From a paper:
The acidic polymerase (PA) protein component of the RdRp plays a critical role in viral gene transcription by mediating the process by which the polymerase performs “cap snatching” from host messenger mRNAs. The RdRp endonuclease activity that is necessary for this to occur is located within the ≈200-residue N-terminal domain of PA (PAN).
Compared to the holo-WT structure, there are no significant effects on the active-site locale, although one small difference is that the Mn2+ ion at the documented low-affinity site is not present. However, it is noticeable that the side chain of Thr38 is rotated compared to the RO-7 structure, which emphasizes the importance of maximizing the hydrophobic interaction surface when the inhibitor binds. Through serial passage of [name]([name]) viruses in MDCK cells under selective pressure of RO-7, we identified an [name] substitution within the PA endonuclease domain that conferred in vitro resistance to RO-7 (up to a 287-fold change in 50% effective concentration [EC50]).
Numbering used by the authors:
A (entry chain A), B (entry chain A), C (entry chain A), D (entry chain A): -2 to 53, 73 to 195
């Protein structure tokens, strides 16, 4: 019965909390035990949804938040209709306007560090990467940040707020030092 | 009690399913017996609605999905107020921005083939044709595709997803080979 | 218990029907007895609302549809803050973008005829007039039609549909010849 | 049991009334006793919300209307991510598009007078000020009025309407002469 678990449930929206619970159980993880991961999973969902909401009405397909199987089905349809290359790991969105997949990251360290780790991992000459930290930095492939400034600013604002809420509950250091 | 019938009811939205049922009974067809047609009818409704949703707020009148009589009443009002020519077969939308009717098609073969068949049929020097296939092709009158790229991409994505769902249930070949 | 009364209640939206009933009782008229006026009042409400919906989000103040007293209060605030001249008769909208009041008319005759009658009546060097007929014509002050083409086309479409519905019930001639 | 209290509850939206009640109790004030302040607090909330609604979708963060603590948390996140200077008094919005805080004022006197008082108070070389009166004037830092004309016009309209409602109840002079 952790403080972090109760904190997450009052910080994030109930739909986000339930998608995060569903995602963690799919990969065999327990949200009551791995409560830092529970927070991170919610955070990442939220960001990905605020991101898709920047931009014009039909711009993004949302991959993140779906069941694994359906997410891959949607990736294949997209691959099979734009001719874009099939990613090896599930990305988070597809950008119909620039014809590319996007991998959104959210990190409690240097973006430099998390970007390289993502780059190396997916090795998809194609897929765009976009990282945000909890201290306001972002880093994106070819310095091309996809959305305009006001929509990314909102996300960075929301991340700093989450950090403050954690810190004022004394949960921030345990969260920071378990990434 | 076919697998296809239950598949359609979980693939499409309930409002689409009910309009499709209404349309088939109007033409004396039974959705429980002619289950490929039931799928096609849902598909065509869906596409036509995703199509009207591309574009700016007042752009399209939606003809498809209405009762026959009301659909013709709306066609006549449009004819009677823009001076456009009265079509012989009901189209699916009217484009207020380009002042033309549009016939949307969705095909399980070559678009070349289905386009000619539509052309020949309506013989309306006026009415624009726009076909989509389930393998991502589209074809439109004067190569003028009406909407921008992202809205048509979404439709082609959704069609490929429907195809995958059918195939993973072993319904795809029976659907493909009954068009 | 007229056919026209039941026709109006199934043709127009319930909120429009209730505002029309409220407006007629304010001027001492009975919607069950004066059923042509009941139709016209609904029609005029509808049009004025479809009109305000053309244009960008804050463009119009809606005067029509309010209680008399509140409508005048809103006119005075507008006069008292833009310095525009106080109209003698209640108009239907205010255009914040062009800084003028608008009088919307809907006629079962020549627009030429109804426009002059409106002009003469309000004598407001200032207030813009915009008439629509049920046969698709419109006429506006300085040939300046305020909205773009697609939003006015929709209105003219809806008016022709109302006319057809009346005619197929044999109510059209009585409505036409009582304006 | 004042007339002003009942007037406010029928003039303003219930959500605004409840936020105003919450704000006044936070600063130890009683909405039943200080009924002019209750009106002013509602007015100021309303304006600030109509203001945030002018502009494009992600443009403003809304600070006003939150609990004190959360409002400061949001200010800090914004400061901590845009590098803008921390204000000493809580502002009402943040403008992501121009990267500044905004202090909205609403006054029953000369805007000249209320602007100086605000200027002097916050002494934030940075924060933009935007005053509206109940007689239609506005005044803003560097004559830069943030929103376009139609959105500010709406606000000034609404303020004059509130003034008229008060005056026709004989509450206006007591409200005017207690600011
Ligand atoms: O907080 C808000 C503000 C506006 C509405 N809303 C509710 C939640 C949506 C996300 C959900 C996303 C979720 C919802 C679950 N499902 C399953 C059936 C279809 C659907 O939408 N989806 C969309 C497809 C993939 C996926 O995982 N969104 C974003 C698009 C509209 C919506 O509900 N959202 C959008 C901005 C932030 C946010 O949380
Ligand atoms: O899935 C969604 C996302 C946004 C809302 N929604 C519900 C269904 C609407 C279509 C219906 C169409 C249908 C609805 C039935 N009726 C009868 C009375 C009026 C009305 O709308 N219409 C519109 C006129 C002709 C016709 O057959 N649409 C499209 C426009 C808004 C709406 O409900 N829709 C729009 C995009 C895909 C889709 O399915
Ligand atoms: O059919 C639709 C499609 C979109 C929503 N909707 C419901 C009715 C609204 C009009 C009402 C107007 C009415 C509603 C009654 N009231 C009294 C309290 C505030 C309010 O709105 N108003 C607006 C101020 C003056 C007036 O008479 N509209 C238009 C603006 C949003 C709305 O509800 N509407 C807008 C397009 C056609 C139409 O009928
Ligand atoms: O009258 C209308 C027309 C459109 C919707 N709506 C309801 C009230 C909203 C304000 C509320 C603001 C309030 C609502 C309370 N909360 C607490 C949880 C999140 C939230 O929204 N917020 C937003 C964040 C800070 C704050 O105090 N707004 C403005 C944005 C959408 C909304 O509900 N609003 C927007 C234009 C005038 C107005 O009164
Ligand atoms: Mn990611
Ligand atoms: Mn068709
Ligand atoms: Mn009128
Ligand atoms: Mn203020």
């Amino acid at each position: 019965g952790s403080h972090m678990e109760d904190f997450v449930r009052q910080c994030f929206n109930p739909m986000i909390v339930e998608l995060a619970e569903k995602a963690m159980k799919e990969y065999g993880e327990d949200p009551k035990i791995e409560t830092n991961k529970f927070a991170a999973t919610c955070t990442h969902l939220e960001v990905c949804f605020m991101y898709s909401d920047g931009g014009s009405k039909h711009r993004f397909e949302i991959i993140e938040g779906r069941d694994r199987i359906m997410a891959w089905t949607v990736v294949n349809s997209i691959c099979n209709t734009t001719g874009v290359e099939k990613p090896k790991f599930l990305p988070d969105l597809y950008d119909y306007k620039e014809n590319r997949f996007i991998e959104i990251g959210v990190t409690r360290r240097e973006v430099h560090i998390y970007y390289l780790e993502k780059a190396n991992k997916i090795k998809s000459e194609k897929t765009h990467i976009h990282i945000f930290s909890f201290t306001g930095e972002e880093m994106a492939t070819k310095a091309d940040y996809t959305l305009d400034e006001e929509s990314r600013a909102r996300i960075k604002t929301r991340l700093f707020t989450i950090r403050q809420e954690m810190a004022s509950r004394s949960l921030w250091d345990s969260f920071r030092q378990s990434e």
